[PDB]
Each structure stands twice: as C-alpha cells, then as structure tokens.
C-alpha cells in the first residue's frame, strides 16, 4: 500500500468521523434542551391545574357562605354541613386555616407560568442528515523484489 | 515494514463500512426523535386545551346557577357578597356555553393516544482488523 | 514514492477504530437514555390527564349534590326549565364518568391513584446530559 494514498483514505475517514462526532455532540444538547422545555411545560401545566382546582373549590365554599349569610340555607342542617365539609377538606389540602377557618389561597403558577402555557413554544431542532462516506481505493506500489514484467 | 495493499484496503473498507452504518442509523434515529418530540408537544398542547375546556365549563355552570337563582328571586347578583361571586365567574369567563377548544380527536388523543416510540437497535462494536503487511 | 509502514498503518487504523467504537457505544447508550426520558415524559402527561379527569368529576359530583340539597330544602324546584338544565349538566357528567349504582346513585372511580398523584407533584425525570466526545486528531502514518 502506497503511503500517500493510504494516509488519504485515513484522513478522509477521520474527517467524516469528526463531522459525525461534532454533529452528534451538538444534536444531543439540542435534544436535552427540548426535553427540559417539554418537562418545564408539563410542570407549569400541573401547577395551573392545581390552581384551577383550588379556585373552583374556594368558590364553592364562598357560595355556601353567601347563601348562609342571607339565610337562604343553614349550614347546620345535615346535608348542608356535608357539602361544607367537602369544600373544607379540599381546601385544607391547600391553603391553610389561619385559625378563623378562613382559607387564604396561594397560586403556584405565576403569570410567566400562565403565559408559557398559553403561548409558549418549543425549540425543535431538525438534524441535517450526514452524507455517507465514499469508498476508497488506496494506491498500491510494487515491492522491489521479484520479476517485473515488460 | 510495508503493509500489503489488499489487506490495508480491507481494513479501510471494514472501517468505512461500519462508519456508514453509524451515519445511517443516527441520521434516521434523529428524525425519529424529532417525530416523537412533535407528538409529545402536540399531546401537551391538546391537554392544555382540555384543561381549559374543563375549567371554563365548570365556571360557566357557576355563572348559570347564579343567574338561575337570581331569576327566581332567591338572590340579587348586585348585592355585595353575591356580586363578588358573580365577578369571580365573569373574571374566569350558548348563554352559558363556550365552544370547546379540544375536539373529539383531541380528547381521544390525550386519553388513548399512543406514540411512535423508536427503540434503537444497538450497533455492534467494530472488531480490530489485523493488517497482514 | 515510499510504501506505507505496516506498524504505523495498523496504529492509524486501530486509532480510528478506537474512536469509532467509542462513538458507537456512546450513541447506543445515549439513545437508550433518550428513549427512557421520552417514556417518562409520556407517562407524566398521561398521569396529569387522569388527575384532570378526577378533578373534573369530583367538582361535578359536588355540583350535583348541592342541587339535591337545595331541592330537598325547597330552595329550588327542579321542574322549572332552567333548574332542569342545571340538573342535566351535573347528571350528564355522572352518567359518563361514574358507575350507576341504581336509582340515580353513583360510585365515582378515580383514574389517578396515589403515585400518579405523587409523580405529578414529585416531578423528576432521568435527564441525561451527554458527555461530549473529543474530536480525533490527525494520525500521520510513518512518512511524509
């Protein structure tokens, strides 16, 4: 094997290898970034769902109180107390009880979280396919020993 | 010294061969990953729409019960306490029917939708080629 | 001009093969890590969807119960057209999402068990960060 041609078929292969190395290093970091975004969106959405749930339950508690205050219902009646306890159990889960029973609500999904859920997008990289490497020849030279025909 | 051509060509060809299998398998895998990502992102977008529809319909119901009670003169939505409840519903919001952002297909997908989850076929390590010389 | 030295060539070839095999093993491994993370993300979205369904039916069940209490209390008459639409909206949900135990009685079954709930609040994804492979340097086969 000729040295010149041999180190050419070696530099060619190596250059192709180095492109594949550089591109995969790159693509993997993109893929990692995309995952963090998707995962971030899911955590934001989970927060939004919790916030949504708590506000609906807080509302249920507030309606029973408004109706009681105006004497339309009496929360001491058995069936009404049961509904009230249902709301308190769900609120106890969140909020607090600041003694006076009142439940102070705290959102977990801030305005950035809300915006991310509403209009956030994702960095979606598309890999630029790599061209396969052409087959090589490699030139060969004659050993100086033995008969060389005319 | 002096490496035999024939043999050296075989080593180079074994090497280039495996390399091309790697360029090919990774070329494809990355497009599969890109696809699975798009599906995952579509599922999240569809779930967000479902969450919104679920929330809005419950708030629509709250507004509707308030108006029904007022209508039969049980409550007055302008009274301070009642108006606070009424304002919460307005703030969150067919008279009390909001069209769904998550359609039948959207609902089908978030509940039963499957994924194009490609499992990579491990490429074997390339054996050492012993060049004759 | 000159012939390629055997020992140098074998060297240059093993050197390339060594780097390529590192790439093969590392991509093999990374792709499995990527697949595992996809499954986790997908499972989490599925668990969140289930938690939303449970949240939904519990709120609708509450709506239905208040209507019954108000009716029993005679605050509302379910015969009126508007009150009947409210009742239909709550019954509607129970019928689709709960088991009819007879005579308008329903048993609510949750799709998101403990763990599903923990997973949702717990978070955590096996997020692998690839260790960059170094470019391979030029090997000069004895000569030139």
CATH number, domain of C50, equals 3.90.20.10
Q: Which residues, including other chains, have CB under 8 Å from residue B69's CB and lie 6 or more apart?
A: B75, C76
- Cβ distance B47 to A45 less than 8 Å, yes or no, reads yes
Q: Is B46 exposed, middle or buried (0-12, 13-18, 19+ CB in 10 A)?
A: buried
Q: How far apart are CA A132 and CA A77, in angstroms?
A: 80
| Residue for token pair 């090997």 | C139
Q: How far apart are CA C18 and CA C14, in angstroms?
A: 6
Q: How far apart are CA B75 and CA B65, in angstroms?
A: 11
C-alpha angle B105/B106/B109, rounded to 5°? 80
Domain count, chain A: 1
**DSSP symbol at B74:** S
| Residue for token pair 């890109």 | B34
Per the entry, the structure determination technique was X-ray
Q: How many helices (H) and strands (E) does chain A have?
A: 4, 0
Alpha carbon of B114: minimum distance to chain A alpha carbons (Å): 17
Which candidate in A19, A28, A63 is best for mutational testing of the B interface (most B CBs within 10 A)?
A63
Query: Which chains sit next to B, with 3 or more Cβ pairs under 8 A?
Result: A, C
On the CB side of A97, CA atoms within 13 Å amount to: 9
Q: How far apart are CA C101 and CA A92, in angstroms?
A: 30
Calculate the CA A20 to chain-centre distance.
26
Resolution as reported, in Å: 1.9
Q: Which among C41, B34, C23 has a CA at the least distance from the CA of A31?
A: B34
Question: CA A108 → CA A44, A64, B128, C85, C124, distances in Å?
Answer: 9, 25, 58, 34, 18
CB contacts, 8 Å: A1 with chain C: 3-4, 9
Radius of gyration of chain A (CA): 35
**DSSP symbol at A121:** -
First to last CA, chain A: 22
Q: Which among B38, B15, B28, B37 has a CA at the least distance from the CA of B121?
A: B28
Q: How far apart are CA B14 and CA A131, in angstroms?
A: 18
Domain hosting A58: range is: 1-150
Determine contact, residues C98/C108, Cβ cutoff 8 Å: yes
- Cβ distance A6 to B3 less than 8 Å, yes or no, reads yes
Measured torsion, CA atoms of residues A3, A5, A6, A9, in degrees rounded to the nearest 10: 160
Q: Which among C95, B19, B56 has a CA at the least distance from the CA of A24?
A: B19
A66 Rama sector, left if φ>0, alpha if ψ -120 to 50, beta otherwise? alpha
């Amino acid at each position: 094997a000729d040295l010149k041609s041999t180190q050419a078929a070696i530099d060619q292969i190596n250059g192709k290898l180095n492109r594949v190395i550089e591109k995969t290093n790159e693509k993997f970091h993109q893929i990692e970034k995309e995952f963090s975004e998707v995962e971030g969106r899911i955590q934001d959405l989970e927060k939004y769902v919790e916030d949504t749930k708590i506000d609906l339950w807080s509302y249920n508690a507030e309606l029973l109180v408004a109706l009681e205050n105006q004497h339309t219902i009496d929360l001491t009646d058995s069936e009404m107390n049961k509904l009230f306890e249902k709301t308190r159990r769900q609120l106890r889960e969140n909020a607090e009880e600041m003694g006076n029973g009142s439940f102070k609500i705290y959102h977990k999904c801030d305005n950035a979280c809300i915006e991310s859920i509403r209009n956030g997008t994702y960095d979606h990289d598309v890999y630029r396919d790599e061209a396969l490497n052409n087959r090589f020849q490699i030139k060969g030279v004659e050993l100086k020993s033995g008969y060389k025909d005319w």
